[PDB]
Amino acid sequence: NPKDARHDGWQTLKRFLPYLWPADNAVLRRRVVGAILMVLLGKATTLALPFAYKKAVDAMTLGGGAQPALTVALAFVLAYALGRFSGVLFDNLRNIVFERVGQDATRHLAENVFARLHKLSLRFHLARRTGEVTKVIERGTKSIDTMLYFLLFNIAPTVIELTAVIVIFWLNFGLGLVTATILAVIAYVWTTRTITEWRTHLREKMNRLDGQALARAVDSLLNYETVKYFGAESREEARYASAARAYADAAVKSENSLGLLNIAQALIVNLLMAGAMAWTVYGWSQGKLTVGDLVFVNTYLTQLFRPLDMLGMVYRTIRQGLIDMAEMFRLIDTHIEVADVPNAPALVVNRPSVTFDNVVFGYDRDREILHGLSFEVAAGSRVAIVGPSGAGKSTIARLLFRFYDPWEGRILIDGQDIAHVTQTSLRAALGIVPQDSVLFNDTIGYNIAYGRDGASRAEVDAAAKGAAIADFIARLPQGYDTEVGERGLKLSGGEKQRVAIARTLVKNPPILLFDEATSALDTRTEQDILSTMRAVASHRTTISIAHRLSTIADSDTILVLDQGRLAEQGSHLDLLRRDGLYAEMWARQAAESAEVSEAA
């Protein structure tokens, strides 16, 4: 098992490797091979071209053997130029061929994570800001992309070139030259890395200061009115200036450190250049080496170290990318709380009854909320679930949609345990109008059609009619194509709730849940929407979970929960007669509204 290993960068890359080498595409595998061949050709070319340069010099200094020297030197000089162009060509061709491979690999990693995030449990509560999340994901995407690019097209070719240069130097020079360049690379890498760590820290500080300065400016600009009201212009200006100065100081330190790293690198490289060139000319003095050799060695070294100029950045980036990618994999690795059983059958709703059978549940194991809740909702009946603050009624919908499983007990629809069926068929049987309904960032027509996968214009028109939102949409300039949500037209609470009702209407489920559906509405809006809800509950099993009893007073039967159990059951009149928990609650709510009516 690959996961049975140390949690380092090597493990992350090993995990990513199947995406690059899919074994499902074969089109991409060919692209990978071709890209690797462009790498090899590009390297062969850049290694070859200095020899062409060396020989051109040799022909000019030892015209004795290669004549007409002019002809020989011309041929080699042209070979060198053509070689240079060829190296660039091979390199860009490998980039181009690979880019599809990279984009595909990362797209699939993203897709896998997205699917997994949809499979994970609600308790992670993905209720956060769009901007924060988007900035984070943007940042991570740029990071993983940069890491992948530097890895494949900078580090890898450089290892190829470094080994090649080592072999060639070995056969043809020194070999003290080999040890010298190897020690030089080792010093260069070690220096770059240790300096880069410090630099990354300064970078983080600088970035934090920048954010602080920017936030002060933005808080001021968005609150221009308040700054005017209190004549606070100078105060705001000063307040920005101090932060701006802190940032500038940090930035100065950060860029200064860049200069130190550059100087260190150039010092190492140039010591090696001096040593190698001196050694080469000295070797020439003894008739051991040609003068082309000087040119050869110099060129080979500059070609070697040119990709390593960036190494600090490359390092910082590769590291961050690896971290970010490990995070991807961690999510993919996190286990799924609610899963279908193996070979789970579909739920088959012939008669849409709902049973709670001795249900024990809580969100967390240290706080049990339902303590053995049992009840039967008859097929086609309209029932309400009410209770005081500790009843556990807010769990019901989430249990029914199997966002969570009971600790003990079970829930049945039409005699089938909902834990043992496919989640999709189960959810297919259920409609919900929640308290706060959320709209996608898209058109109102899209938001209504969302109830069913292939929803037609006719179906949407029908639902919007049944939701009595059809006219409101007709009066919109752009109609069903009116964009809604944030960054879109703002809808009133009743309008949004109507879109939600319409949505479930498009769904057309046998069982429907009103989950505090009117609880966030004003009184008149509530009274308006209740008649619509009454209509849409027509021939379905309807469970209405409500705070305000008067809104559910017309139910076929009412389930009264107290302390995570069924305390009271019956019609509104039966419950008023029993003079128990429901009656008390009723009385209290009546009193409240009277008091509210008093204040005029």
Ligand X SMILES: CCCCCCCCCCCC[N+](C)(C)[O-]
- Binding to a copy of itself, residues 2-61 (CB under 8 A): 56-57, 60-61
Look up residue 571 and give its two tokens: 């019609």
Give the residue from 555, 223, 531, 210 showing the smallest Cα distance to 378: 555
Interface with ligand X, residue 210, by CB under 6 A: yes
Phi, psi of 290 (to 5 degrees): -75, 165
Interface with a copy of itself, residue 107, by CB under 8 A: yes
Give the nearer residue to a copy of itself in terms of CB position, either 90 or 315.
Answer: 90
- Whether the Cβ atoms of residue 42 and residue 90 lie closer than 8 Å to each other: yes
Query: What is the rounded radius of gyration, in angstroms, for the C-alpha atoms of the chain?
Result: 36
- Which partner in ligand X, a copy of itself, none is near 323 (CB below 5 to 8 A by kind)? ligand X
Interface with a copy of itself, residue 594, by CB under 8 A: yes
List the interface residues with ligand X, window 301-330 (CB under 6 A). Answer: 323-324, 327-328
Give the residue from 520, 519, 506, 441 showing the smallest Cα distance to 469: 506
Candidate residues 163, 179, 242, 256; the one interacting with a copy of itself per rule CB under 8 A: 256
Look up residue 1 and give its two tokens: 């098992």
Give the nearer residue to a copy of itself in terms of CB position, either 10 or 114.
Answer: 114
Beta partners for residue 338, in sequence order: none
Give the nearer residue to ligand X in terms of CB position, either 149 or 356.
Answer: 149
Candidate residues 503, 529, 542, 564; the one interacting with a copy of itself per rule CB under 8 A: 503
HSE value, Cβ hemisphere, 13 Å, CA-based, for 30: 3
CA angle 88, 94, 100 (to 5 degrees): 140
Q: Are strands 354-361 and 370-377 parallel, antiparallel or unpaired?
A: antiparallel
Interface with a copy of itself, residue 88, by CB under 8 A: yes
- Which partner in ligand X, a copy of itself, none is near 255 (CB below 5 to 8 A by kind)? a copy of itself
- Which partner in a copy of itself, ligand X, none is near 109 (CB below 5 to 8 A by kind)? ligand X
Cite the beta strand spans of 286-386 per DSSP E: 354-361, 370-377, 382-386
List the interface residues with a copy of itself, window 293-332 (CB under 8 A). Answer: 294-295
Q: Is 495 helix (H, G, I), strand (E, B) or coil?
A: helix
Distance of closest approach, residue 95 Cβ to ligand X, in angstroms: 16
Interface with ligand X, residue 217, by CB under 6 A: yes
Interface with a copy of itself, residue 423, by CB under 8 A: yes
Candidate residues 17, 33, 137, 535; the one interacting with a copy of itself per rule CB under 8 A: 137
List the interface residues with a copy of itself, window 219-238 (CB under 8 A). Answer: 219-233, 235-237
DSSP string of 461-505? HHHHHHTT-HHHHHTSTTGGG-BBSTTSB---HHHHHHHHHHHHH
Fill in the DSSP letter of residue 356: E
Which amino acid makes up residue 429?
Answer: A
CA angle 508, 513, 515 (to 5 degrees): 140
- Which partner in ligand X, a copy of itself, none is near 140 (CB below 5 to 8 A by kind)? ligand X
Positions touching ligand X (CB under 6 A) are: 106-107, 109-110, 113-114, 136-137, 140-141, 144, 210, 213-214, 217, 244, 247, 323-324, 327-328
